[PDB]
Amino acid sequence: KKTFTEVQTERLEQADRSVLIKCPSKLNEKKLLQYLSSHGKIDNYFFFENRGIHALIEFSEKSSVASLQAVTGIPKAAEHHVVPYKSRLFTFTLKNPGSQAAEERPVKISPQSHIPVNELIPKLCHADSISSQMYILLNEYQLTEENIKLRYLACSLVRDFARAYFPDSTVKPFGSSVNTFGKLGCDVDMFLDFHDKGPFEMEYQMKRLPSERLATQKILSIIGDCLDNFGPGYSSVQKILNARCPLVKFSHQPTGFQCDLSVSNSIAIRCSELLYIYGCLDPRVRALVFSLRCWARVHGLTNSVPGTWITNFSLTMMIMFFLQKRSPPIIPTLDQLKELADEKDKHVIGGYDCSFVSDLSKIKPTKNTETLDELLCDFFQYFGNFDFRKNSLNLRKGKEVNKPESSPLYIWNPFEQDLNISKNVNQPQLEKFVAMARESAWILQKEDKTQQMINKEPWGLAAVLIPF
Amino acid sequence: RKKTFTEVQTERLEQADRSVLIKCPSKLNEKKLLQYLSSHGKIDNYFFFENRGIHALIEFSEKSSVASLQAVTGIPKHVVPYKSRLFTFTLKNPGSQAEERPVKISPQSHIPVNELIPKLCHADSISSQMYILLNEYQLTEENIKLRYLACSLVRDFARAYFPDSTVKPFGSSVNTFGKLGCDVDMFLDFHDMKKGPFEMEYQMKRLPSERLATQKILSIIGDCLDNFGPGYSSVQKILNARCPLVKFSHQPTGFQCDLSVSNSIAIRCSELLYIYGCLDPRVRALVFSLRCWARVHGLTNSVPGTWITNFSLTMMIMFFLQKRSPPIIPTLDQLKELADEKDKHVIGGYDCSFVSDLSKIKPTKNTETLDELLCDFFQYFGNFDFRKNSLNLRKGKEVNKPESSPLYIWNPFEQDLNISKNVNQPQLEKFVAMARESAWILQKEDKTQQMINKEPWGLAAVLIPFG
Ligand SMILES: Nc1ccn([C@@H]2O[C@H](COP(=O)(O)OP(=O)(O)OP(=O)(O)O)[C@@H](O)[C@H]2O)c(=O)n1
Ligand SMILES: Nc1ccn([C@@H]2O[C@H](COP(=O)(O)OP(=O)(O)OP(=O)(O)O)[C@@H](O)[C@H]2O)c(=O)n1
Ligand SMILES: [Mg+2]
Ligand SMILES: [Mg+2]
Description:
The structure is a homodimer. Chain A is an alpha+beta fold. In chain A, a hairpin with a 4-residue loop joins strand 13 and strand 14 (399-401). In chain A, 40% of the residues are buried. Chain A has one domain. In chain A, helix 8 packs across helix 9 and helix 9 packs across helix 10. In chain A, the strands form four sheets. The first copy, chain A, has a five-stranded mixed beta sheet with strand order 5-6-10-9-8, with helices on both faces. Chain A has helices at 4-16, 29-37, 63-70, 117-125, 130-141, 145-163, 212-229, 266-281, 283-298, 312-324, 334-340, 372-384, 427-445, 449-454, 461-464, and strands at residues 18-22, 42-49, 53-59, 89-94, 170-174, 188-193, 200-204, 234-240, 247-252, 258-263, 348-349, 352-353, 392-394, 399-401, 411-412. Helices cover 39% and strands 16% of the residues of chain A. Chain A has 15 helices and 15 strands. The radius of gyration of chain A is 25 Å and the shape is globular. At the A-B interface, helix 2, strand 4, strand 7 and helix 7 of A face helix 2, strand 4, strand 7 and helix 7 of B. Bound molecules: cytidine-5'-triphosphate (2 copies) and magnesium ion (2 copies). One magnesium ion is lined by residues 175-176, 186-187, 189 of chain A. Chain A: Mg(2+) 1 binds at residues 176, 189.
């Protein structure tokens, strides 16, 4: 019965006691771990390729990090010419390169990126059914245990800067990184949450802060500067402080992730939890999202830069809606969750009741037995013939409703009164989605699967994951 | 039996290390406060001073007493929750007390010049006058403790990002020539069987120079002082100067400060000047009075420019004292010869070695009174040939000028560096004029008759403007 909030805490606690070691060219796995173990017990570890062999070490005790740091030196080779900020990024070399005294064995490399689309298409064609195809993609794309540990670590490193002056700060991931829908190679979205008996009243002297937004801008501005200059391995630091939600984008060389740092927004975190739930409730949920996400990227309906396009988040929200409207529903409405919540799970933010259940056992498993074969096609059919001018998507009620605005695509932000999450989406783009969906359905409906396999040509999911 | 500069520094820092600052209540009971505080630990020293309210410095005998006190201190229930050694004490029930006896206030600034002039006139001889000024101006024990503390706080603050930092004062603050109200010059310095088969080290960015890193470290610390650190204002990032710098005002101790990254050449100066000042009271006496003289006659200025700097002026005075018969202080080379391998320091190519122990130096036989030395100083430099000669403190001799600057003073720890390169002809000439006027007055003045008149005499006669 592991709640999102539970899982997050354990993950953070583990990344908290983890480090990164750039390995020697000729690496002896055993001698390394044997050595390191001297500083403390090791719960987990793995190796990955990134401009050389790096290795993530997760000690059982946080004290092991101090222990290891205690015997780590500053590069005297390059001595006064560096910024002497110490963190958990280490570089190991052999004292005596000519004292190599055991058999060189290779090391297992955990992959941190997924295969390209073109490499995937063949594998999909050799599958049996569509269900299989979708589940292949899912597996080939989803985040690995190692990848996750690596994401949480990246957050943990960024935190360490914040604590300098807000000891109680936390850097926590949200979005795809933690909501079960993360594909390999995605960005790590980080939220900085910073504040959280004599005859005398004795008090610390402490410098006052400005307004929420103005302080936010300054804290991020300074952290940004530190990432850049105390580093190491932070590049393309981009201070985008003036947006609706102040932001620092940056590229982290050691973990390979590009990242987005912003100050805690508890509305966005509740989304990520809600999506965490849905994803956990049924594998069909995840399967669909991943495939339809890929579909969208393939047909240029989505884009890595913001704009008039649909965002994966909105698209994900549309999919959740779709799954709410099954007979019977595959996932419950948000209100159905709110009803099952106890006082423990009561959260009310910015006026609006963002309450819903945390324990998954409280929810009744779905009776629905639809295969993905159907759900994939039905999705295209459903939205292909959806009346976007007359209707909007409400995930609280799980019903089509009247539009409180005159935007082309309106999706009810579930944790705000009166907010369109697809407000950015224009008519031209929406129309292309509908076209692409209607083409996609038509193909799936009127295609000869058995005969396409025989011809070696694409079919099912593959037929809609190639451009038209 | 005296102690090395390096010794004294360490003991001072160690004491400031276990000290805090308490903003006191309006109605303050000295006894109840100390009685209370003593519960957390034994108290070696303490004092009170006025600065936008009554503040108090408490030096515990144990560093553990600071933790003890912090353990019962709350956050003001907004703010940047950086916890340090700045506390604010108030009464639970203000209006049920009555309690306030007065308190003794250690003064952190010296009296103005105009208040000093009378006191100087009522003295007996010039020696006395110079020693009065010295005392009225020099740093008090309390003031010093307060300076070291200021450094200690910045260290703790720096340690937030660089756990292995030290912040150490240099310059007038520690070289024995500090007058009250002067800036605290801080140097940020970084300093810290093998079991395995690996050489393990940190991943850190390679920057082209030491200078470029220095600029970034200070830039970021500066920003933090400004936005996070308590009681830091007027932060001025002056990163591009010869020695990158952050100036800032520390409200609690009242000091304006100057943060820079450790420069070991500047520290050796401070030690050298520490030595000279310690060797003889005449040394200090002279410097303080002539420093004041210069300020009075606008030969020096608080902003940089074509003026002479107190440092250069101090260097000229040291030179003057080297050229006595017999010398009052030894040359720098005379010190270098008395240094052991223990005191060998060689930085940036140049041998900056000299003795640390003062007993190794033979006490000066010279017995000249200040009466003479003050006048002689004006005479000496009044008739000095600045166009043909330069001041070398290593040799203690006038030498040919390696450049064609008007006033050339050999930087003792560098190669071909003029410390008074900034000084132009017009300004130099005004110094010489002022010196020659100053000497003439002292030489041809009727001391006894000026006292009878009530008008100024001796040091006072040269510490009033010539309008
Ligand atoms: N209009 C929006 C957009 C985003 N968010 C929140 O901010 C997060 C960050 O956005 P994004 O990174 O696009 O979400 P991901 O699901 O991480 O998308 P992707 O798979 O493309 O990384 C979202 O997850 C969501 O919780 C929101 O509340 N309202
Ligand atoms: N041309 C110069 C100027 C300054 N310094 C060094 O910078 C240090 C600090 O400079 P400053 O604070 O100006 O010296 P103080 O004697 O502290 O000046 P003041 O009496 O005005 O406080 C000095 O110890 C000196 O070694 C130097 O080496 N060469
Ligand atoms: Mg993202
Ligand atoms: Mg100074």
